[PDB]
Amino acid sequence: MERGEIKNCSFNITTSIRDKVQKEYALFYKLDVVPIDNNNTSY
Amino acid sequence: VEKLWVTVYYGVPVWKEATTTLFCASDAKAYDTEVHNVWATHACVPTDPNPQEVVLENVTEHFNMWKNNMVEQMQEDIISLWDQSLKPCVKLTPLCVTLNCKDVNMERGEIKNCSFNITTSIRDKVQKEYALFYKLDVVPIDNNNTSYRLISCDTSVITQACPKISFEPIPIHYCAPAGFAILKCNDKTFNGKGPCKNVSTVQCTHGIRPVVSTQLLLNGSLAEEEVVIRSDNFTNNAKTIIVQLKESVEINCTRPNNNTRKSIHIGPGRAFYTTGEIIGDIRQAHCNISRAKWNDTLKQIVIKLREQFENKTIVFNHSSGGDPEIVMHSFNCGGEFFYCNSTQLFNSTWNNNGNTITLPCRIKQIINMWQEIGKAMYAPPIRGQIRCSSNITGLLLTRDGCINENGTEIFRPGGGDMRDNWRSELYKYKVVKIEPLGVAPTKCKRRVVGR
Amino acid sequence: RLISCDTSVITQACPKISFEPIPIHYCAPAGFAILKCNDKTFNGKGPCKNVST
Amino acid sequence: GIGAVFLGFLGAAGSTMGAASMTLTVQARLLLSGIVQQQNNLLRAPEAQERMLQLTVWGIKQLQARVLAVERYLGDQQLLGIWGCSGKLICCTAVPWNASWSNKSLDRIWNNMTWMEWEREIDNYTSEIYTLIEESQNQQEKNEQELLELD
Amino acid sequence: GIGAVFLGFLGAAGSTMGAASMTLTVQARLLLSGIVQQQNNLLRAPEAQERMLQLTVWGIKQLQARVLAVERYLGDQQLLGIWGCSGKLICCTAVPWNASWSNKSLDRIWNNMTWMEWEREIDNYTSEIYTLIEESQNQQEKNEQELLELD
Amino acid sequence: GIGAVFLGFLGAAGSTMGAASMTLTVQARLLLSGIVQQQNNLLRAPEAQERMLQLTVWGIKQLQARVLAVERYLGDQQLLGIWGCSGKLICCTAVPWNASWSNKSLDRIWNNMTWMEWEREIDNYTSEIYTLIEESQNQQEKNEQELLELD
Amino acid sequence: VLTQSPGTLSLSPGETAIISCRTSQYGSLAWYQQRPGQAPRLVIYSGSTRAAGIPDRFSGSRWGPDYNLTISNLESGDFGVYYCQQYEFFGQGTKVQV
């Protein structure tokens, strides 16, 4: 069970306010998330 | 007697203390003219032309204003209407843009001229727009640059109340349902809690204007004999002291500025209105009241205050603290929400052994009545200048529970909770449930000596 | 630009729904009644003769 | 004179039990239709927006209370039925007066106490009383049946 | 023959007051249950989406009108009660006929006018009439009471 | 003993038609008010959020069913009215027993069959039966009228 | 204004004690008890009425200017300091020790 079930991911979002694209980091489960194209660092 | 027998009776004059969903009566001249949207008034029934009431002889009901659900019902209603009426109205959620505010020319920058970029009805135009704001309605960021942000934009959802609607306080009656009854205290000077003497049955109450103020009681009902003071317990210093005037003192107020409406369309089918400019001089909002009338009214109060307290001398004072709502006389005047600094009216010591008053006022547009969950309302500016005249009918005081040698007893403008606004008027009334069935013995058998 | 995009809120009616004009009757409630003019040539306004419930 | 003239809703609230015994119709009426007469009549004012924007906040306040008034009313009419007397107002039974309910005499009951006052003094027993009348009917309902068989 | 055969809802609309006096059940029925029989019966069609997506636009149209039909009906049954006669259809009173209401005679009332026609000619007085029957009951209700005391 | 003691709702479901003829009040009560007594009583628990957030999912489940219970109940009370007997429980008619409905005799009907069982064997004719009682009233209603004219 | 008498307040686990409190005007009475580390714990909320986790031992008992709180059958948790409260006011208080 060491395929990467818990994953640490980053992404940019606009806050309560449209004047801040804050690069935030959060955790996800391998099932709760799905990759794109080649398995880069991107899900 | 005889062989007595139970006999049952339908239509007896019996009730019990009760609570149930009431319903509202509208007014004829109110509904007929459109007034467009106004609260939820349109959805009510019309009040009966004949103001019908029946006086009850030989009864002495107990009334206690404090535990009266009509006010737990009134505010329940009052909030529900607002939320639902503002449900469809324009959302100002994208206006959370960084406001580049320069000030205009009580001179700290109350009116501020700010700029910001927004996307229009259409995503292909970032239009740099300029608009006006009040110093309270807005808040700066980091170092005081030229940059501000709306007062609660980041933490709440601001909703522009549509200008088509109106906040005019249309009076209201609480008509009772069938099998129920609403009773009245037809006395002159009623304590608020305790037994009544002149009691009667009505279908609906008298017209309750749902005005919402924070310190003085406006346009309500006056006392009948002499001014009266009402509290749950006066030793309970954490309990609001309601006063009801005999003579109403008229208070004239105004926003002197002649404003111009400016519709900036955030779109698609909706726009955000603001003051385009100010036609003429720039001035301050205020409220005028005769200081003779006011302090001769304060004479009415103290003598009836000294009745609940000892003949010990009394003192009045400005509010200890709280939101602008509470610490200042707040009210609507022509569609705009005022916040008058009431230090003047409450700064006096009344013992035993000219001109007029002008209270400064600030206008807020982004407001949160009832202190809701990240839910704020932006009142659009009203075109031109506005001038309105209220009758002070009473007010709310709060005692300082730490009696002192000098002291002696301090009373500052209360008004944290809103349930008292309704108690101040709904004190006269109470609801009961009718129970028409009743069994009683009278010598009569069920006629079955033969079959 | 779309005909009313800037000034209105355009909503794409779901294709799952249909605008087919299904006939309809207005059934009356209790204690009420709906009357009919069972005439051939009725003016539209005025008295009827062949009436029914 | 006094019994053939006007009085008013709940007028005899502080009048003796005997006095109130004339003004039943007053409080036996309007239990229902006190509001359905007024509602239907006052609501057909020239508004033409009865139930506009479908139902609203006053929408349920009324219907939640409209639907109450009738079942509340039909509850007392169900008692009249189940006690075999929906003649209303006044009706005798075979159920005798258990003095355990009130030892007091006739004279003072009808001419000194009032119904509000009385129903209180008798409140606790009403449950047991009411159940006695139901079992008074069913004795009679079987006694009726038995005679339907043989004639 | 004619009174023991079929007629139909509102059939005697243009029939004399006397004629209509047989076909009451026709229009005394279905005041309520005219629709609750049909609704419950037709609504249990194999749909299984009665009140799906909670309540809708036809949702209130019915309930706002369902709840009306009964109180409207219970209003006339409350009058039968408060006039002391819920035998329905036909019931006599002590209230005499004030000729101020209609000077006309018996012969032509029942055999020439129809109820639609009649209730119009008498519409304005009905309020005063109806109130006379209520005060006719209460006189009787007190007269009943007085005799309950002494026997 | 047996008819003057406790039984319970629907207790005589498998008891003879004669037996059940005593325990009507049991199932003649609570048709309505079986729930309005309990609802009003249990709902005034110290919650103070009766109908909070206006109406909800249980909001209609009750009212759609509250409003049913009464019209359903008023449907059977409308039959009692239109058959001229709202004395309930038991009531005779002039409509005679067409043996085409059931050729069987008295003895076994009341002492061997049960009502659930019986109403089945007679289910198909009930429509024709019920309509006979309505035409039994109207014959009587005209015969009443005819005599109101001449005296 | 409150006069919480008397002051010494030292006895054995096998005994009984009664604490009095005086007032000029009327009011809503209450009582508390402090502990090592812990803060005041409520034990009375009207006068006659008890708080949560309070046995029959805690007897409140007098309709008059003098009101008292009795806790018969003493124990080791009973050590600490008590106070009588009426509205915003408090009592002098009293400390019982080992």
Ligand SMILES: *[C@@H]1O[C@H](CO)[C@@H](O[C@@H]2O[C@H](CO)[C@@H](O[C@@H]3O[C@H](CO[C@H]4O[C@H](CO[C@H]5O[C@H](CO)[C@@H](O)[C@H](O)[C@@H]5O)[C@@H](O)[C@H](O[C@H]5O[C@H](CO)[C@@H](O)[C@H](O)[C@@H]5O)[C@@H]4O)[C@@H](O)[C@H](O[C@H]4O[C@H](CO)[C@@H](O)[C@H](O)[C@@H]4O[C@H]4O[C@H](CO)[C@@H](O)[C@H](O)[C@@H]4O[C@H]4O[C@H](CO)[C@@H](O)[C@H](O)[C@@H]4O)[C@@H]3O)[C@H](O)[C@H]2NC(C)=O)[C@H](O)[C@H]1NC(C)=O
């Ligand atoms: C305690 O109680 C007291 C007493 O009740 C409270 O004080 C009251 O407060 C209310 C509101 O707070 C006031 O009512 C508003 O009054 C303003 C101004 O009054 C107008 O009318 C005066 C003469 O009366 C005439 O009209 C009335 C009917 O309104 C009629 O009955 C009468 O016979 C007479 O014909 C004018 O004197 C007055 O000033 C004019 O003249 C001045 C110079 O003399 C000049 O300086 C002014 O600029 C002006 O030219 C003024 O014309 C009303 O505007 C307001 O009515 C608005 O709201 C209703 C409901 O929505 C709407 O139907 C109206 O048309 C109007 O709304 C539109 O018009 C406004 C301009 O008139 C505009 O500002 C609005 O934005 C709105 O515009 C919208 O619609 C237009 C088309 O109409 C559209 O083109 C726009 O684009 C936009 O969409 C109310 O009537 C009471 O006057 C006041 N009473 C007293 C004694 O002070 C007190 O508040 C209470 N206390 C508390 C705490 O509540």
Ligand SMILES: *[C@@H]1O[C@H](CO)[C@@H](O[C@@H]2O[C@H](CO)[C@@H](O[C@@H]3O[C@H](CO[C@H]4O[C@H](CO)[C@@H](O)[C@H](O[C@H]5O[C@H](CO)[C@@H](O)[C@H](O)[C@@H]5O)[C@@H]4O)[C@@H](O)[C@H](O[C@H]4O[C@H](CO)[C@@H](O)[C@H](O)[C@@H]4O[C@H]4O[C@H](CO)[C@@H](O)[C@H](O)[C@@H]4O[C@H]4O[C@H](CO)[C@@H](O)[C@H](O)[C@@H]4O)[C@@H]3O)[C@H](O)[C@H]2NC(C)=O)[C@H](O)[C@H]1NC(C)=O
């Ligand atoms: C909010 O503020 C309120 C005040 O505005 C406040 O309410 C009051 O609170 C107090 C205490 O909490 C209530 O109790 C009072 O206590 C008095 C004590 O006096 C007795 O004791 C003295 C000392 O021991 C004696 O000196 C005294 O006289 C005797 O002794 C003398 C010695 O020389 C001798 O010479 C005398 O002749 C005499 O023998 C006395 O024994 C008490 O006196 C006081 O008055 C009651 O009795 C009077 C007659 O003495 C009556 O005239 C008066 O009306 C009081 O009657 C009570 O009982 C009546 C019948 O039941 C009721 O109609 C009254 O309303 C009153 O009711 C009290 O008792 C009820 C008993 O069931 C109880 O149910 C009620 O709730 C109520 O407690 C009185 O008992 C005082 O009653 C409260 N109310 C008022 C208006 O003062 C309240 O606490 C604050 N807070 C809240 C939340 O409300």
Ligand SMILES: *[C@@H]1O[C@H](CO)[C@@H](O[C@@H]2O[C@H](CO)[C@@H](O[C@@H]3O[C@H](CO[C@H]4O[C@H](CO[C@H]5O[C@H](CO)[C@@H](O)[C@H](O)[C@@H]5O[C@H]5O[C@H](CO)[C@@H](O)[C@H](O)[C@@H]5O)[C@@H](O)[C@H](O[C@H]5O[C@H](CO)[C@@H](O)[C@H](O)[C@@H]5O)[C@@H]4O)[C@@H](O)[C@H](O)[C@@H]3O)[C@H](O)[C@H]2NC(C)=O)[C@H](O)[C@H]1NC(C)=O
């Ligand atoms: C992102 O991540 C995803 C998922 O992890 C990747 O998705 C794959 O995408 C590629 C795209 O090309 C697909 O590849 C196809 O592979 C076809 C041939 O596959 C055959 O060989 C596989 C080799 O794996 C063996 O070796 C590894 C270690 O080297 C072992 O872990 C593994 O278990 C295998 O070991 C067995 O086999 C070897 C011999 O090869 C023996 O020696 C051992 O003893 C073991 O017996 C093998 O894994 C394949 O198995 C699949 O197919 C069989 C049926 O034949 C099935 O039963 C299995 O369950 C399994 O599904 C297979 O035998 C090739 O022909 C084709 O063209 C294509 O290239 C691949 O299918 C995708 N996998 C999935 C799960 O979707 C993705 O590549 C990755 N991307 C990046 C950028 O990282």
Ligand SMILES: *[C@@H]1O[C@H](CO)[C@@H](O[C@@H]2O[C@H](CO)[C@@H](O[C@@H]3O[C@H](CO[C@H]4O[C@H](CO[C@H]5O[C@H](CO)[C@@H](O)[C@H](O)[C@@H]5O[C@H]5O[C@H](CO)[C@@H](O)[C@H](O)[C@@H]5O)[C@@H](O)[C@H](O[C@H]5O[C@H](CO)[C@@H](O)[C@H](O)[C@@H]5O)[C@@H]4O)[C@@H](O)[C@H](O)[C@@H]3O)[C@H](O)[C@H]2NC(C)=O)[C@H](O)[C@H]1NC(C)=O
């Ligand atoms: C954006 O705008 C906001 C709000 O306007 C600014 O917010 C301030 O942010 C700074 C950040 O550093 C905070 O500064 C702190 O200041 C502490 C020392 O403050 C003490 O001195 C103050 C000096 O003001 C005096 O002088 C001016 C004129 O020069 C007068 O107007 C003013 O009234 C004062 O006059 C009195 O004092 C002088 C002597 O200094 C006498 O000679 C006079 O006769 C007068 O008697 C003073 O204003 C401070 O008062 C505060 O504190 C007392 C209690 O001691 C309280 O009673 C007052 O009501 C008041 O709150 C104080 O005495 C310093 O130690 C600390 O490290 C820090 O630097 C400042 O607190 C923030 N203010 C607020 C309201 O939040 C922000 O700076 C600004 N940003 C930009 C970029 O512009």
Ligand SMILES: *[C@@H]1O[C@H](CO)[C@@H](O[C@@H]2O[C@H](CO)[C@@H](O[C@@H]3O[C@H](CO)[C@@H](O)[C@H](O)[C@@H]3O)[C@H](O)[C@H]2NC(C)=O)[C@H](O)[C@H]1NC(C)=O
């Ligand atoms: C309610 O009323 C009924 C009668 O309607 C009571 O039943 C009867 O009660 C009496 C006791 O009071 C029974 O006994 C008889 O009492 C007299 C003297 O009191 C004595 O002379 C007799 O010899 C005998 O002891 C009587 O048998 C009984 N009747 C029946 C049919 O059981 C009933 O007790 C009353 N209940 C309450 C709660 O009031």
Ligand SMILES: *[C@@H]1O[C@H](CO)[C@@H](O[C@@H]2O[C@H](CO)[C@@H](O[C@@H]3O[C@H](CO)[C@@H](O)[C@H](O)[C@@H]3O)[C@H](O)[C@H]2NC(C)=O)[C@H](O)[C@H]1NC(C)=O
């Ligand atoms: C409704 O009917 C009642 C009777 O049921 C009327 O009351 C009675 O009216 C007559 C007047 O018509 C009263 O006076 C008598 O009239 C005759 C001649 O008309 C005369 O011979 C007598 O000497 C006397 O004048 C009669 O006293 C009165 N009855 C009572 C009990 O008051 C009533 O007037 C009618 N009202 C209407 C509006 O029609």
Ligand SMILES: *[C@@H]1O[C@H](CO)[C@@H](O[C@@H]2O[C@H](CO)[C@@H](O[C@@H]3O[C@H](CO)[C@@H](O)[C@H](O)[C@@H]3O)[C@H](O)[C@H]2NC(C)=O)[C@H](O)[C@H]1NC(C)=O
């Ligand atoms: C329902 O019951 C009614 C009576 O309440 C039946 O009407 C009567 O039916 C009899 C036939 O059984 C008619 O005729 C007579 O029959 C006897 C022998 O059965 C014979 O002796 C006579 O000479 C004559 O034939 C009788 O006239 C008739 N009554 C009326 C007023 O028409 C009715 O047939 C029954 N219907 C059903 C479906 O059971």
Ligand SMILES: *[C@@H]1O[C@H](CO)[C@@H](O[C@@H]2O[C@H](CO)[C@@H](O)[C@H](O)[C@H]2NC(C)=O)[C@H](O)[C@H]1NC(C)=O
């Ligand atoms: C005049 O006012 C003084 C206060 O300035 C009153 O003195 C109070 O008297 C009451 C009793 O009547 C005491 O309970 C207070 O403690 C007193 N307070 C002070 C500050 O002295 C005095 O009673 C008043 N006299 C008259 C005749 O009204």
Ligand SMILES: *[C@@H]1O[C@H](CO)[C@@H](O[C@@H]2O[C@H](CO)[C@@H](O)[C@H](O)[C@H]2NC(C)=O)[C@H](O)[C@H]1NC(C)=O
């Ligand atoms: C009332 O009089 C007292 C003195 O009798 C004044 O009390 C002083 O209050 C200040 C706080 O403002 C304290 O720092 C002093 O220690 C107090 N002095 C004394 C002697 O008590 C009080 O200021 C007076 N109040 C008013 C409004 O004048």
Ligand SMILES: *[C@@H]1O[C@H](CO)[C@@H](O)[C@H](O)[C@H]1NC(C)=O
């Ligand atoms: C006040 O601020 C405005 C901002 O545009 C500026 O134009 C004006 O000159 C200022 N007034 C004075 C007296 O400097």
Ligand SMILES: *[C@@H]1O[C@H](CO)[C@@H](O)[C@H](O)[C@H]1NC(C)=O
């Ligand atoms: C009823 O009994 C009580 C005692 O339980 C007595 O005080 C009262 O006077 C009695 N009433 C009558 C009318 O005898």
Ligand SMILES: *[C@@H]1O[C@H](CO)[C@@H](O)[C@H](O)[C@H]1NC(C)=O
């Ligand atoms: C009626 O009389 C009894 C005693 O005979 C008494 O207890 C009761 O209070 C009286 N009712 C009234 C209203 O005074």
Ligand SMILES: *[C@@H]1O[C@H](CO)[C@@H](O)[C@H](O)[C@H]1NC(C)=O
């Ligand atoms: C009733 O009176 C009117 C006059 O008011 C008269 O024309 C009419 O013929 C009268 N009717 C009868 C039946 O007498």
Ligand SMILES: *[C@@H]1O[C@H](CO)[C@@H](O)[C@H](O)[C@H]1NC(C)=O
């Ligand atoms: C009945 O007769 C009267 C006069 O006797 C007349 O006014 C009325 O119109 C007649 N009714 C009909 C339906 O013709």
Ligand SMILES: *[C@@H]1O[C@H](CO)[C@@H](O)[C@H](O)[C@H]1NC(C)=O
């Ligand atoms: C009724 O008729 C059927 C035949 O149709 C017969 O079998 C049955 O026994 C009859 N019942 C009686 C009680 O005669």
Ligand SMILES: *[C@@H]1O[C@H](CO)[C@@H](O)[C@H](O)[C@H]1NC(C)=O
């Ligand atoms: C009653 O008797 C009939 C025949 O006499 C029979 O058909 C029926 O099943 C019996 N009922 C029961 C419950 O056994």
